[PDB]
Structure 1
Amino acid sequence: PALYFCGSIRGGREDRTLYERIVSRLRRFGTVLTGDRLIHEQDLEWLQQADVVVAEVTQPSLGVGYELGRAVAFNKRILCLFRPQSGRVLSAMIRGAADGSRFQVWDYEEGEVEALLDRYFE
């Protein structure tokens, strides 16, 4: 299973450790795939190749959202991970895009992410 993890740039520095925890945990279930035109074409290739797309959606990000819309149009299996303790309110578009099976949105607290990722792929 090629697994695509997408996280924000701001979230890649603020939630840096958390993203690394997600990526290493994902590596137990499959192969983790992860100018501007180059960056774009490459992520798009990875999205099309992915068996599952995993997004951390706590940090509002244009790129992560864009990649989720591209993923939804490719009919990809998607898991979004959102942290309510942050105080943010997840965009109604992302939660509203959930269908509970192919597109799921899980609210979690940072300390249980390994257990939720095991639950998802087990």
Structure 2
Amino acid sequence: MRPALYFCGSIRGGREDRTLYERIVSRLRRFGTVLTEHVAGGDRLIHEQNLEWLQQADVVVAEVTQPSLGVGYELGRAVAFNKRILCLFRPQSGRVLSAMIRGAADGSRFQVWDYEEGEVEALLDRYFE
């Protein structure tokens, strides 16, 4: 019925980019249904729901600037499902993207884009149009 875009960003890793994430999610809605956590014993259900969303998504979009086990885990499951993946990283003095994420990239099905906050809407438009 509609293209599904899975979005993932850090939560327990840190909520420093929480405002940037809502900007990304709101842009993504222009291109399809966005499947993403709504962030304010429960962990198993959280794992289940994100795994199902990732599996049925047509594109996986990850903001990978803040280090996060959960985001890395979701990317690992996404790769093993051979998902189309877009990773968004903001270079910063003292912050280097994991070699496991940068090294997973191939420039087509798994893309890593270095960007800064001001251009994120333009980047998303360019990737999705």
**1:119 Cα deviation from its structure 2 partner:** 0.3
108-117 vs 81-90, which moves further: 81-90
C-alpha separation between the residues in 1 aligned to 2:5 and 2:33?
6
**1:17 Cα deviation from its structure 2 partner:** 1.4
Normalised TM-score (structure 2)? 0.90
C-alpha separation between the residues in 2 aligned to 1:11 and 1:85?
17
Aligned to 1:107: 114
**1:73 Cα deviation from its structure 2 partner:** 0.4
SS in 2 for 1:13: coil
Distance 1:10 1:88, change over 3 A: farther
**1:22 Cα deviation from its structure 2 partner:** 0.2
Query: C-alpha deviations, 1:24-48, integer Å up to 9, x for none?
Result: 0000000001111111111110011
C-alpha separation between the residues in 1 aligned to 2:64 and 2:13?
9
Normalised TM-score (structure 1)? 0.95
The CA RMSD measured in Å over matched residues stands at 1.3
C-alpha separation between the residues in 1 aligned to 2:128 and 2:94?
28
Larger helix proportion of the pair: 1
SS in 2 for 1:19: helix
Query: C-alpha deviations, 1:78-104, integer Å up to 9, x for none?
Result: 000000036310011100000100000
Determine if contact 2:9/2:63 at 8 Å carries over to the other structure.
yes
20-29 vs 77-86, which moves further: 77-86
Determine if contact 2:14/2:68 at 8 Å carries over to the other structure.
no
SS in 2 for 1:54: strand
Distance 1:17 1:114, change over 3 A: same
Unaligned residue ranges in structure 2 (runs of 5+): 37-41
Distance 1:61 1:29, change over 3 A: same
**1:12 Cα deviation from its structure 2 partner:** 6.5
Aligned to 1:61: 68
**1:10 Cα deviation from its structure 2 partner:** 5.1
Number of residues of Structure 1 aligned to a counterpart in Structure 2:
122
Determine if contact 2:5/2:28 at 8 Å carries over to the other structure.
yes
